Design an enzyme around this catalytic site. Structure first.
Site, PDB file in Angstrom:
ATOM      1  N   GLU A 208      -3.378  -0.222   8.303  1.00  0.00           N
ATOM      2  CA  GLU A 208      -3.116   0.645   8.529  1.00  0.00           C
ATOM      3  C   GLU A 208      -2.907  -0.286  10.035  1.00  0.00           C
ATOM      4  O   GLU A 208      -4.217   0.084  10.945  1.00  0.00           O
ATOM      5  CB  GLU A 208      -3.001   1.907   8.756  1.00  0.00           C
ATOM      6  CG  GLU A 208      -2.217   2.529   7.884  1.00  0.00           C
ATOM      7  CD  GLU A 208      -2.322   4.022   8.035  1.00  0.00           C
ATOM      8  OE1 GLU A 208      -1.458   4.295   8.965  1.00  0.00           O
ATOM      9  OE2 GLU A 208      -1.949   5.089   6.832  1.00  0.00           O
TER      10      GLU A 208
ATOM     11  N   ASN B 181      -7.906   1.594   9.815  1.00  0.00           N
ATOM     12  CA  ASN B 181      -7.226   1.147  10.395  1.00  0.00           C
ATOM     13  C   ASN B 181      -6.826   1.286  11.830  1.00  0.00           C
ATOM     14  O   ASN B 181      -8.006   1.810  12.321  1.00  0.00           O
ATOM     15  CB  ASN B 181      -5.758   2.888  10.269  1.00  0.00           C
ATOM     16  CG  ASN B 181      -5.543   3.010   8.736  1.00  0.00           C
ATOM     17  OD1 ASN B 181      -5.437   2.316   8.291  1.00  0.00           O
ATOM     18  ND2 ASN B 181      -5.199   4.707   8.122  1.00  0.00           N
TER      19      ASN B 181
ATOM     20  N   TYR C 214      -4.881   1.409  15.586  1.00  0.00           N
ATOM     21  CA  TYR C 214      -3.787   1.627  16.809  1.00  0.00           C
ATOM     22  C   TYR C 214      -3.416   1.829  17.928  1.00  0.00           C
ATOM     23  O   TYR C 214      -3.107   0.900  18.729  1.00  0.00           O
ATOM     24  CB  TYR C 214      -3.092   2.691  16.312  1.00  0.00           C
ATOM     25  CG  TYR C 214      -2.499   3.283  14.772  1.00  0.00           C
ATOM     26  CD1 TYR C 214      -3.415   3.291  13.705  1.00  0.00           C
ATOM     27  CD2 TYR C 214      -0.908   2.614  14.376  1.00  0.00           C
ATOM     28  CE1 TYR C 214      -2.463   3.805  12.213  1.00  0.00           C
ATOM     29  CE2 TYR C 214      -0.121   3.411  13.584  1.00  0.00           C
ATOM     30  CZ  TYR C 214      -0.883   3.853  12.631  1.00  0.00           C
ATOM     31  OH  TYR C 214      -0.824   3.362  11.360  1.00  0.00           O
TER      32      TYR C 214
ATOM     33  N   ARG D  13       1.273  -1.328   0.000  1.00  0.00           N
ATOM     34  CA  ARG D  13       0.216   0.162  -0.370  1.00  0.00           C
ATOM     35  C   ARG D  13       0.919   1.341   0.083  1.00  0.00           C
ATOM     36  O   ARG D  13       1.703   1.331   1.270  1.00  0.00           O
ATOM     37  CB  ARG D  13      -1.023  -0.166   1.348  1.00  0.00           C
ATOM     38  CG  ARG D  13      -1.831   1.265   1.136  1.00  0.00           C
ATOM     39  CD  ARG D  13      -2.879   1.039   2.157  1.00  0.00           C
ATOM     40  NE  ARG D  13      -3.679   2.922   2.545  1.00  0.00           N
ATOM     41  CZ  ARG D  13      -3.705   3.669   3.622  1.00  0.00           C
ATOM     42  NH1 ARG D  13      -3.163   3.155   4.733  1.00  0.00           N
ATOM     43  NH2 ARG D  13      -4.378   4.499   2.976  1.00  0.00           N
TER      44      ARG D  13
ATOM     45  N   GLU E 251      -7.978   8.038   5.770  1.00  0.00           N
ATOM     46  CA  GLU E 251      -8.730   9.366   6.918  1.00  0.00           C
ATOM     47  C   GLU E 251      -8.577  10.444   6.844  1.00  0.00           C
ATOM     48  O   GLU E 251      -8.620  11.322   7.632  1.00  0.00           O
ATOM     49  CB  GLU E 251      -6.865   9.075   8.017  1.00  0.00           C
ATOM     50  CG  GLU E 251      -6.303   7.606   7.900  1.00  0.00           C
ATOM     51  CD  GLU E 251      -5.686   7.791   9.454  1.00  0.00           C
ATOM     52  OE1 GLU E 251      -5.348   8.828   9.936  1.00  0.00           O
ATOM     53  OE2 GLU E 251      -5.345   7.223   9.729  1.00  0.00           O
TER      54      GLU E 251
ATOM     55  N   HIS F 298      -3.443  11.256   0.108  1.00  0.00           N
ATOM     56  CA  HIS F 298      -2.492  10.729   1.862  1.00  0.00           C
ATOM     57  C   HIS F 298      -2.248  11.934   2.013  1.00  0.00           C
ATOM     58  O   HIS F 298      -1.157  11.883   2.824  1.00  0.00           O
ATOM     59  CB  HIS F 298      -1.938   9.814   1.622  1.00  0.00           C
ATOM     60  CG  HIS F 298      -1.900   8.812   3.279  1.00  0.00           C
ATOM     61  ND1 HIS F 298      -2.273   7.486   3.664  1.00  0.00           N
ATOM     62  CD2 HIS F 298      -1.102   9.528   4.277  1.00  0.00           C
ATOM     63  CE1 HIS F 298      -1.614   7.666   4.210  1.00  0.00           C
ATOM     64  NE2 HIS F 298      -1.338   8.953   5.123  1.00  0.00           N
TER      65      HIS F 298
HETATM   66  O1  LIG Z   1       0.215   8.136  13.062  1.00  0.00           O
HETATM   67  C1  LIG Z   1       0.573   6.808  12.879  1.00  0.00           C
HETATM   68  C2  LIG Z   1      -0.283   6.878  10.948  1.00  0.00           C
HETATM   69  N1  LIG Z   1      -1.244   7.281  11.104  1.00  0.00           N
HETATM   70  C3  LIG Z   1      -2.097   7.436   9.754  1.00  0.00           C
HETATM   71  C4  LIG Z   1      -1.702   8.081   8.404  1.00  0.00           C
HETATM   72  O2  LIG Z   1      -2.514   7.522   7.781  1.00  0.00           O
HETATM   73  C5  LIG Z   1      -0.499   7.770   8.827  1.00  0.00           C
HETATM   74  O3  LIG Z   1       0.296   8.331   7.234  1.00  0.00           O
HETATM   75  C6  LIG Z   1       0.441   8.189  10.238  1.00  0.00           C
HETATM   76  O4  LIG Z   1       2.116   7.945   9.840  1.00  0.00           O
END
Ligand SMILES: OC[C@H]1NC[C@H](O)[C@@H](O)[C@@H]1O
Length: 436
Positions: free
Chosen positions: A342, A287, A289, A75, A164, A119
């Site tokens: 992600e 995504n 985290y 990606r 995002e 992006h």
């Molecule tokens: O913050 C980590 C990561 N989060 C999501 C974003 O897509 C990416 O560009 C960023 O580096």
């Protein structure tokens, strides 16, 4: 052991401005991230994307690393201003050439390209015309998308309109922490709406141009939990997570609590666009985290710090979040395909005297989340793939180079790449098609 379905797609992910450098090489126009990071005070340590990982020159090496790791999908995003330096009109053949070499090389080496169209590096020329605030961006975005589909849709078959869009709208236009650095809530919600309209126009163009490929869209998502015994969690999910966008796409309106908070900030006749916005998509990208403990606070929402392991971002590590969000998207909207586009972590990586990066912390983080993703597969979520953010340590937006998310370490003084323990580890997961 935890084995994934046959053909499951293991990938790594990058974005143009974070890795490429040379933002003005070969006729490229300035992007809003060029101008934002060259404005004093906007990015930690005055860092910019002028050089980054120098991927603009080192792309072949980086892909050879993907190949060597046996990673099956890459990606990456395309820089809108490399392709159309004023955003619309002129097309820059040298910009097309750069991504053409990357695409052809990937296909030669048997790696599946997943292209993110946007992006975050909006052409500066279009920001002068209002950027995401201007309804006309739906046309500008369509024209840009068209160019990509026409030039690359013969080889790239997996496309993502927006990365995002909540961040693009809210962090760029309300918080003012990301380009274009604005703090206006009415602008921020017009950007939400126009992101949807641009996404939907690009899908429509896609159906007309690349009749044998798939297209989707990527959302940031947090796992929100309530501080006691719930509505704050409800709002955060509907606002910060996929529902802000998926409720329009699947149901033809914004989520209830989003409207409760934000109706006054949306265009007056915003519903007139909703039928167009419902253009059918092929997959959802999520995504994920971090988890957050949330409470009402007379936004009307605040975060509660918890014990729990954290990353160098200070993001709490909550692997069950990735399972929750996968279960929740199926339950709420039942998209035909889902990808984790992600997942990753920033740690304070050090090159040991043995020449290696012993990021056991990143391995632990990845392992746990992959296990939770596996679980969701067993329980019926149509998860087709999983992408590690990131292939490389890179420019982490307003944090600059101070946050390292790579499975490959980049020494910025020399541009040397050093595969981390997590990269070697991930390679084995890919080879094995899962955990052991
Ligand atoms: O913050 C980590 C990561 N989060 C999501 C974003 O897509 C990416 O560009 C960023 O580096």
């Amino acid at each position: 052991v935890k084995k994934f379905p046959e053909g499951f797609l293991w990938g790594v992910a990058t974005a143009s401005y974070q890795i490429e450098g040379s933002p003005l090489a070969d006729g490229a126009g300035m992007s809003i991230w060029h101008t934002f990071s060259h404005t004093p005070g906007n990015v930690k340590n005055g860092d910019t994307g002028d050089v980054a990982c120098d991927h603009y020159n080192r792309w072949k090496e980086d892909i050879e690393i993907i190949e060597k790791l046996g990673v099956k999908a890459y990606r990456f995003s395309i820089s809108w201003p490399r392709i159309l330096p004023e955003g619309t009109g002129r097309v820059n053949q040298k910009g097309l050439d750069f991504y053409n070499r990357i695409i052809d090389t990937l296909l030669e080496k048997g790696i599946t390209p997943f292209v993110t169209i946007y992006h975050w590096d909006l052409p500066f020329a279009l920001q002068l015309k209002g950027g995401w605030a201007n309804r006309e961006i739906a046309d500008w975005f369509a024209e840009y998308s068209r160019v990509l589909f026409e030039n690359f849709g013969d080889r790239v078959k997996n496309w993502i309109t927006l990365n995002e869009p909540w961040v693009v709208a809210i962090v760029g236009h309300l918080y003012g922490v990301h380009a274009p650095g604005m703090r206006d809530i009415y602008v921020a919600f017009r950007a939400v709406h126009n992101l949807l309209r641009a996404h939907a126009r690009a899908v429509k163009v896609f159906r007309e141009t690349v009749k044998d490929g798939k297209i989707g869209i990527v959302f940031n998502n947090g796992y929100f939990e309530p501080a006691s015994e719930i509505r704050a969690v409800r709002f955060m999910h509907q606002f910060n997570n996929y529902p802000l966008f998926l409720n329009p796409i699947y149901r033809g309106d914004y989520p209830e609590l989003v409207l409760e908070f934000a109706r006054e900030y949306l265009p007056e006749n915003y519903k007139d666009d909703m039928s167009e916005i419902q253009e059918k998509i092929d997959f959802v990208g999520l995504n994920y985290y971090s988890g957050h403990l949330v409470k009402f606070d007379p936004a009307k929402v605040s975060f509660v710090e918890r014990d729990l392991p954290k990353t160098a971002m200070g993001w709490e590590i909550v692997p069950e979040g990735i399972y929750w969000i996968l279960k929740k998207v199926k339950e709420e909207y039942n998209p035909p395909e889902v990808y984790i586009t992600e997942n990753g972590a920033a740690f304070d990586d050090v090159v040991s005297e043995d020449g290696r990066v012993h990021d056991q912390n990143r391995i632990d983080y990845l392992k746990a989340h992959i296990g939770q993703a596996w679980k969701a597969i067993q329980e019926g979520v149509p998860l087709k793939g999983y992408f590690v953010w990131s292939l490389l340590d890179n420019f982490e937006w307003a944090e600059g180079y101070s946050k390292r998310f790579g499975i490959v370490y980049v020494d910025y003084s020399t541009q040397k790449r050093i595969v981390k323990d997590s990269g070697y580890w991930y390679s084995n997961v890919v080879k094995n098609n899962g955990l052991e």
